Structure 1
Amino acid sequence: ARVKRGVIARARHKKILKQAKGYYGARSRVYRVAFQAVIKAGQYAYRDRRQRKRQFRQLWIARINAAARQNGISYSKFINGLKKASVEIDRKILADIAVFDKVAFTALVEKAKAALA
């Protein structure tokens, strides 16, 4: 029972090459190079599912800081005031309000200031 490897080998190689579309030069054409690139890409993606969470929180904090200082308080003190006032709105929502509803953000700041007093 001799087994020829042609049909199966072709299918495996095409699978990897399909995932390498868009890559530069040999990275999207040659199997040896394409395989390494596909593996690397997956390794970055696993790491970046975690990094995405870090970067977005960092962005929200920066926007809250700016909006709060426009109302005359720093981010650090603003967060403390909300905690003392038992407000549980998270940073994702706070950053959204800071950009779209500036009146509502002012009301939040006043509540924080009252609690700190």
Structure 2
Amino acid sequence: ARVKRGVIARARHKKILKQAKGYYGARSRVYRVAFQAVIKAGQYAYRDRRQRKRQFRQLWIARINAAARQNGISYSKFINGLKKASVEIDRKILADIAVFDKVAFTALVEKAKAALA
């Protein structure tokens, strides 16, 4: 039994070339380069599902510190005041209140200031 390879080889190449669209030059046209590019994009996707959480945490903390200093307190004193009041609101929602509802954020800052002393 002799097995020709061309159909299944063509399918295995077309899958990798389909996952390589948008890439520059031989990275979207040539199987040898596109296979390395697809594996490198996979490594980056694995690393950046971890990196995304870190970056959004950084952004939330920068906006909380911005709006807290707009209200007259630093970040560390404000998070101390929300721990010493037993308030479990995370930093995503605090950044969202810092953007969209500044009076509710002023209420939270007054709560943390009263708890801070």
TM-score (norm: length of structure 1): 0.99
User: How much is the aligned-residue C-alpha RMSD, in angstroms?
Assistant: 0.5
Measured in 1, the distance between the counterparts of 2:13 and 2:116 equals 64
Deviation at 1:114, TM superposition (A): 0.5
Gaps of 5+ in 1: none
SS in 1 for 2:37: helix
Aligned residue pairs: how many?
117
Measured in 2, the distance between the counterparts of 1:25 and 1:68 equals 48
Measured in 2, the distance between the counterparts of 1:70 and 1:39 equals 46
SS in 1 for 2:88: coil
Structure 1 runs (4+) greater than 3 angstroms displaced: none
Measured in 1, the distance between the counterparts of 2:4 and 2:113 equals 78
Deviation at 1:83, TM superposition (A): 0.3
- Residue 116 of structure 2 is matched in structure 1 by 116
**Cα deviation 1:91-110 (Å, max 9, x = unaligned):** 00000000100000000000
Gaps of 5+ in 2: none
**Cα deviation 1:69-106 (Å, max 9, x = unaligned):** 01110000000001001111000000000010000000
- Between the two proteins, what is the percent identity of the paired residues? 100
TM-score (norm: length of structure 2): 0.99
SS in 2 for 1:20: coil
Measured in 2, the distance between the counterparts of 1:2 and 1:88 equals 68
Measured in 1, the distance between the counterparts of 2:3 and 2:103 equals 74
Deviation at 1:116, TM superposition (A): 1.2
